[PDB]
Symmetry: D2
């Protein structure tokens, strides 16, 4: 388990090459683990993708709303709640793995602490229809490891768009204005990829799907020392009737 | 008339040195904005143009709702007024060929602006009204467009110009989303009364979709460079909604 | 009485919202400038600081003309005043530990600013006077520097700050010129009286060499972040305190 | 010789297509710069060897040391040796290749406009040859639009000698604003290896070579061409320091 990942990473990374990833993580708020920079063995990834497949078919929940705390940006997708995913022993132990968190802490350059609100530890988003999107937003917590389990071709949409070095003002998000002042980075993803995101200071969204395509991710959210008290009444993934949500 | 008036308006607000700085920005971004800090036409001239356009819209508005295969099937959801209709405006047509207007902007393009383009693309009015209306990602067939931001929604409703300079249009392989993955997007917010010069052939651009029923109106004056003086694609959707490259939605 | 007046000076100019915007710029560029549009200290306070430094310069300036091996043999061609001389100044030393100043700037760093650094690096004055004087490409050992641009030449004479944020310092392989080949350089012009906050550990930086015999004078207040505590100093490259440090080479 | 164009046309046809040249044209407009390295050779290795050997003989015979400041570019230094255009034109190979219809035709696909080999006779060709610590080609623009630069010999990147570039700028000789432009714009640094070639948009790209940090050799050949916008142009500035060390704009 841990011993297999410790050996797997030891053959694919050096302190020097991980320091280069830390540069790119702080510069873009984003670092991708693809065929050239794998993070988990293919067996470990298949097991997690299989467990997520059983969880989607069993507990998927449609969402279609505008979130007021992010300028009424849309959330049009299906979700599997954190409390359901936590029952997967595989996903639960892996998210708290001392080998995994220790390795990525060399990229964040600060302690990764698996202590977040129990409704936000894990989240699966499953998009299926044209115009499905995870609109522009920030996270309440500092870190997220995103598993790009199933990604459509880039021509169908689903790319991550990001503006790093921003912050979330839930009473004045200024999202389109911040786009007008800042260059947007678009990150294309392939199935099997993973990426680490600095969610609290990186404004981000997924580009809306142009046709009916399948886009599935797993979100493992972690805290830094900086993450306190939650606010906004905007927990739309856990509560579709949240005060900040406006149904569509 | 307007030429002698425009020449004096520009001479009080620009030097060759400051035009050269605009030429820097126009080559760097494919875009230079004529806002309240850098006016291009007197307020009376724009009011005349906008009034002519609002009549052309009220009379000749033609709704467009399609996908364009030559630009990766990006949408065109708007109303248009065709060039032949707009060319009936003596004002818009005369202004678009003004040797004072073109001579000034040629200090920004650093090359001759030639008012010799196809008779169906000399002028275009687009007019977005409903949620999700957009002028999707595309290039122009010609080098230059002077865009009149006659009416702009508030930025929180969308309608911003997004642009990626230093690209080109391959109609058999546009690679729009792949180009976005490789390049940074510049977003240009626009207020009513703004104009901007756009390098349309090498700047991939779109307008951000309307997040709510809002009004977004522009006039497009398209010009050629010496490099533009044979068309292809079968994709002239604004003049012909039944173009071979237009798909239905 | 410094902290009481400084807190008023800052409360007139800054809000949590405006500081958050500065924190965004500080994270993005490794650098936020406190110029005429964003003053940090009252003019009478900076004047007092600058006169302390000119006295220290007149009494304790030492010429440095060397290359540093831990930063790719980049030059240090300047005069300096050592930290232990500057710490004798009651004004500078107490200001550098001001809970009001450090508390304010911590809203830009978004983390605690800790005035616990090596006694040979709490303060540094660099004083360049001659053509080709430069503070060559380098990083700092600590996270933070507040730089007082006490005297700046005209921009056409050089002396600008050049910076590449989001980098790191490997003293055995600093890769200075290779990093410049892979990254864009931000040049920051400074005027006399400016101050700026610098993320010194992850921002590769230098001062553009003087093209004329002009005078360029700064005060460097260096502080630690939590990450810097307990960590060990390596490199044998403390050239400002020891001109014949092991990593220093003749120029 | 004589059969150089027939072979060069084949060499390019093996490596380049209109689609792939169109990608290079996008980079050239964006950066003012496109590099021909091992992944994208421009000329056969035998042909570059002949050009380098020609340049080595021209250097040993006709080099001239320069150490000055140029006022039309803000007193930035020129600290190097040079070989002037009239001496380089005596090489039948270099002079023929610089007007090659195959070479110019190919590069015109990257410039997206005609490349015209009609420039001032003192500026058709230039070899710069740096040898000593602090040697540099200081920040400047060119009077003409295009230059193909042959990086015949380049030191290790740790020793300096990289190209730095700020594209989408302009040269005002009475007020060049070198350091002000650097404050407003990001600097692109382009490292080079011996054997590389690159195309540069010299009239709108502010550029220099990073000063050598120690005694190393850095040797380039500069083939300068015009665009239509440079034709019948009045040369101004009195700053042609490579031809005339006593040029009015030059300062010792
Ligand atoms: N706050 C985010 C949701 C976080 C999902 C769980 N980490 C948003 O506005 O969409
Ligand atoms: N080529 C443009 C149309 C421009 C018409 C006016 N210049 C498009 O596909 O949207
Ligand atoms: N590390 C710096 C010296 C900083 C001393 C004051 N913080 C250098 O090598 O130049
Ligand atoms: N204008 C350049 C010289 C270019 C000569 C060769 N094309 C300079 O000032 O250094
Ligand atoms: Cl258009
Ligand atoms: Cl040159």
């Amino acid at each position: 388990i841990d011993e297999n990942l410790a050996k797997f990473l030891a053959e694919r990374y050096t302190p020097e090459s991980v320091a280069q990833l830390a540069d790119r993580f702080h510069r873009f708020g984003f670092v991708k683990f693809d065929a050239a920079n794998r993070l988990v063995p293919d067996e470990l990834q298949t097991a997690v993708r299989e467990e997520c497949d059983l969880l989607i078919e069993q507990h998927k929940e449609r969402r279609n709303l505008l979130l007021s705390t992010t300028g009424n940006t849309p959330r049009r997708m299906s979700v599997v709640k954190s409390e359901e995913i936590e029952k997967s022993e595989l996903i639960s132990t892996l998210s708290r793995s001392e080998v995994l968190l220790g390795f990525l802490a060399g990229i964040t350059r600060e302690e990764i602490i698996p202590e977040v609100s129990s409704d936000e530890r894990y989240l699966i988003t499953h998009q299926e229809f044209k115009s499905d999107t995870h609109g522009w937003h920030w996270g309440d917590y500092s870190f997220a490891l995103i598993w790009a389990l199933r990604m459509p071709p880039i021509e169908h949409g689903g790319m991550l768009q990001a503006v790093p070095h921003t912050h979330w003002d839930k009473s004045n998000p200024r999202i389109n204005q911040t786009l007008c002042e800042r260059e947007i980075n678009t990150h294309g993803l392939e199935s099997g990829d993973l990426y680490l995101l600095r969610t609290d200071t990186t404004l981000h969204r997924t580009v809306p799907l142009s046709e009916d395509s399948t886009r599935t991710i797993l979100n493992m959210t972690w805290a830094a020392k900086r993450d306190k008290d939650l606010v906004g009444n905007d927990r739309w993934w856990e509560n579709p009737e949240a005060e900040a949500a406006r149904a569509v």
